[PDB]
Design an enzyme around this catalytic site. Structure first.
Site, PDB file in Angstrom:
ATOM      1  CG  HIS A  40      35.316  29.753  40.828  1.00  0.00           C
ATOM      2  ND1 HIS A  40      34.431  29.195  41.726  1.00  0.00           N
ATOM      3  CD2 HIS A  40      35.448  31.051  41.184  1.00  0.00           C
ATOM      4  CE1 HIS A  40      34.059  30.114  42.600  1.00  0.00           C
ATOM      5  NE2 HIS A  40      34.664  31.250  42.292  1.00  0.00           N
ATOM      6  CB  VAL A  57      45.752  45.633  59.704  1.00  0.00           C
ATOM      7  CG1 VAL A  57      46.561  46.017  60.947  1.00  0.00           C
ATOM      8  CG2 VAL A  57      45.135  46.866  59.060  1.00  0.00           C
ATOM      9  CG  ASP A  84      33.708  25.836  41.800  1.00  0.00           C
ATOM     10  OD1 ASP A  84      34.945  25.766  41.625  1.00  0.00           O
ATOM     11  OD2 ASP A  84      33.076  26.892  41.994  1.00  0.00           O
ATOM     12  N   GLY A 175      34.470  37.432  45.646  1.00  0.00           N
ATOM     13  CA  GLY A 175      35.479  37.513  46.662  1.00  0.00           C
ATOM     14  C   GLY A 175      35.227  36.614  47.842  1.00  0.00           C
ATOM     15  CB  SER A 177      35.012  32.785  44.950  1.00  0.00           C
ATOM     16  OG  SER A 177      34.022  33.213  44.053  1.00  0.00           O
TER      17      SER A 177
HETATM   18 CA   LIG Z   1      45.699  40.638  59.053  1.00  0.00          CA
END
Ligand SMILES: [Ca+2]
Length: 223
Positions: A40, A57, A84, A175, A177
């Site tokens: 997904h 960063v 998945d 996130g 995931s």
């Molecule tokens: Ca970094």
């Protein structure tokens, strides 16, 4: 990751960030040229970011490598999230070191009660949203299939397992995931789905990697 802890820079050296102009999914480096993630998470134009801690960063240990090919599992069902799992081949081999390292595939499936490490840059709130810039970690046990099926009646296939806490408060989230669930040094799970995040009686559901080792190996051998 909700209710987790800051991993520490490069303490999860197989953790990858999939980037399409922004972090959108995690993944796991399984050898110098291949990443495993969730189907997904599929999209075109993926850059794989290795060696990340703060994804906003440049800290010095990153390797940014474009994907050359993505292979979604042939039986992936986006409605049920069965199967998945997806493989991503890197355009060039990563340089492996103490901070960028592959995670081993399992030779056997992990049992309920096994403690695993789940990691990602996903949402850290169960209500609302706060996305961390540094990698978050969660130690969580694999739940029994019976408790998993009881939490999600009719939705758990043999290719899924539950991990987490039925009391809620600690879970992977949006996130995370595609990211890894590592138990005893082996990749046993892929962050796949759940009802909300960290909700009571709604643990995280993970792709059961041990069911795919033959597919993974055969695919890597021929691509
Ligand atoms: Ca970094």
């Amino acid at each position: 990751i909700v209710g987790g802890y800051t991993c520490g820079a490069n303490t999860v050296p197989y953790q990858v960030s999939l980037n399409s102009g922004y972090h959108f999914c995690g993944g796991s480096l399984i050898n110098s040229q291949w990443v495993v993630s969730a189907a997904h998470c599929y999209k075109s134009g993926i850059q794989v970011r290795l060696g990340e801690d703060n994804i906003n960063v440049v800290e010095g240990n990153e390797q940014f490598i474009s994907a050359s090919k993505s292979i979604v599992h042939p039986s992936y069902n986006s409605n049920t999230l069965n199967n998945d799992i997806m493989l991503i081949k890197l355009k060039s081999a990563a340089s492996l070191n103490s901070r960028v390292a592959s995670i081993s595939l399992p030779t056997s499936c992990a049992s309920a009660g096994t403690q695993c490490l789940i990691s990602g840059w996903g949402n850290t709130k169960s209500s609302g949203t706060s996305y961390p810039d540094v990698l978050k970690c969660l130690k969580a046990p694999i739940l029994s299939d019976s408790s998993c099926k009881s939490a999600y009646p009719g939705q758990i296939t043999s290719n899924m397992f539950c991990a987490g806490y039925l009391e809620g408060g600690k879970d992977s989230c949006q996130g995370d995931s595609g990211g890894p669930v590592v138990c005893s040094g082996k990749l046993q799970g892929i962050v796949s789905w759940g009802s909300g995040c960290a909700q009571k009686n709604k643990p995280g559901v993970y792709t059961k990697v041990c069911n795919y080792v033959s597919w993974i190996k055969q695919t890597i051998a021929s691509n």
